[PDB]
């Protein structure tokens, strides 16, 4: 007798494993719909005896599987799992060296922006609500980052090789972060329209666009008003474990002891390359696999991260 059937497990979350008896005369596709083995699309291939006992990813095709997928990924986007697997097939071949004491990514497939995201996240006090991200994030910190990168890509709506942006990616990822108690209060004054207090929560409490300087947000920054004037605003209260300050790329000085980490962007509107700046015993520039230690830094910066716990202004009235 030749082997005619094998047992395998199917899954949408790599936790709940569903036993299947596979007919070796049919493709995986004919039995399960689109099917993946460690990210590889095996929809069109027939089973091999060596597949016995292995785990295959499938698409959520009934209410139980849809619920498992929602519970794990925190999205109802039906294209998600397929995009995640498509990315994973490539990211499993990336290398994740330890550079400046952090897990970095050796350059491949225009992944510099992802390396900068990964490096930043390891330095923030952040956790993810979606179990897929939290579990992958833990593994990534130790150097097993292929799954985390594939997830970031899928959550971002980016494919492997696509040119990306750190701030855009962070906006997508932080939607799944533990920011429900993050709070920001801003005092806003327009000479025409008057005063108001703006309260922001979640992602909007930790991300700012317009200046790289947390000090400047504290002391006063210009912001457009609906009337056409420039109003001024300053930070009254902040409750979060970090803040991310972003601005269109420009030359900026970074001084050890005054920030957590940052993204350098060399380039312009068309094209650019993202590197990571951090500090340990001195300033570090981490460009994928490559470290440069620095005694000063003045260069093109787009995002600066700062530690926070709780801040309250001393500006009166
Ligand atoms: Na960074
Ligand atoms: Na995961
Ligand atoms: Na901010
Ligand atoms: Na302030
Ligand atoms: Na990097
Ligand atoms: Zn106004």
From Swiss-Prot:
Boundaries of the shown chain within the full protein: 1541 to 1854 of 4382
Subcellular location: Host membrane; Host cytoplasm
Documented effect of changing residue 223 to L: In strain: Isolate BJ03
Membrane topology: Multi-pass membrane protein
Zinc finger (C4-type): 190-227
Catalytic machinery residues: 112 (for pl-pro activity), 273 (for pl-pro activity), 287 (for pl-pro activity)
Catalytic activity: Thiol-dependent hydrolysis of ester, thioester, amide, peptide and isopeptide bonds formed by the C-terminal Gly of ubiquitin (a 76-residue protein attached to proteins as an intracellular targeting signal)
Domain notes: The hydrophobic region HD1 probably mediates the membrane association of the replication complex.
Domain Ubiquitin-like: 3-58
Name the UniProt record assigns to this protein: Papain-like protease nsp3
Cofactor: Zn(2+)
Residues noted as binding Zn(2+) 4 in the record, renumbered to the chain: 190, 193, 225, 227
Superkingdom in the source lineage: Viruses
Entry function: Responsible for the cleavages located at the N-terminus of the replicase polyprotein. In addition, PL-PRO possesses a deubiquitinating/deISGylating activity and processes both 'Lys-48'- and 'Lys-63'-linked polyubiquitin chains from cellular substrates. Plays a role in host membrane rearrangement that leads to creation of cytoplasmic double-membrane vesicles (DMV) necessary for viral replication. Nsp3, nsp4 and nsp6 together are sufficient to form DMV.
Domain Peptidase C16: 72-315
């Amino acid at each position: 007798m030749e082997v005619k059937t094998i047992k395998v497990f199917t899954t949408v979350d790599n936790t709940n494993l569903h036993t299947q008896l596979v007919d070796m005369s049919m493709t995986y596709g004919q039995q399960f719909g689109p099917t993946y083995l460690d990210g590889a699309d095996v929809t069109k291939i027939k089973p091999h005896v060596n597949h016995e006992g292995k785990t295959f990813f499938v698409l959520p095709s009934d209410d139980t599987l849809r619920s498992e997928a929602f519970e794990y990924y925190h999205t109802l986007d039906e294209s998600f799992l397929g995009r995640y697997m498509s990315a994973l097939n490539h990211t499993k071949k990336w290398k994740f060296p330890q550079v400046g004491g952090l897990t970095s990514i050796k350059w491949a497939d225009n992944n510099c922006y992802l390396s900068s995201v990964l490096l930043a996240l390891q330095q923030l006090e952040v956790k993810f609500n979606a179990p897929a991200l939290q579990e992958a994030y833990y593994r990534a910190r130790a150097g097993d980052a292929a799954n985390f990168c594939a997830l970031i890509l899928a959550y971002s709506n980016k494919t492997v090789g696509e040119l990306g942006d750190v701030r855009e990616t962070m906006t997508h990822l932080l939607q799944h972060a533990n920011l429900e108690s993050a709070k920001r209060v801003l005092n806003v004054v327009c000479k025409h329209c008057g005063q108001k207090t703006t309260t922001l929560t979640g992602v909007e409490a930790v991300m700012y666009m317009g200046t790289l300087s947390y000090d400047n947000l504290k002391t006063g920054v210009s912001i457009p008003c609906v009337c056409g004037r420039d109003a001024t605003q300053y930070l009254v209260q902040q409750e979060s474990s970090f803040v991310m300050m972003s601005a269109p790329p420009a030359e900026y000085k970074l001084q050890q002891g005054t920030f957590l980490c940052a993204n350098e962007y060399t380039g312009n509107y068309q094209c650019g390359h993202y590197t990571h700046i951090t500090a340990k015993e001195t300033l570090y520039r981490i460009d994928g696999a490559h470290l440069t230690k620095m005694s000063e830094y003045k260069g093109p910066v787009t995002d600066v991260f700062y530690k926070e716990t709780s801040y309250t202004t001393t500006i009166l009235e």
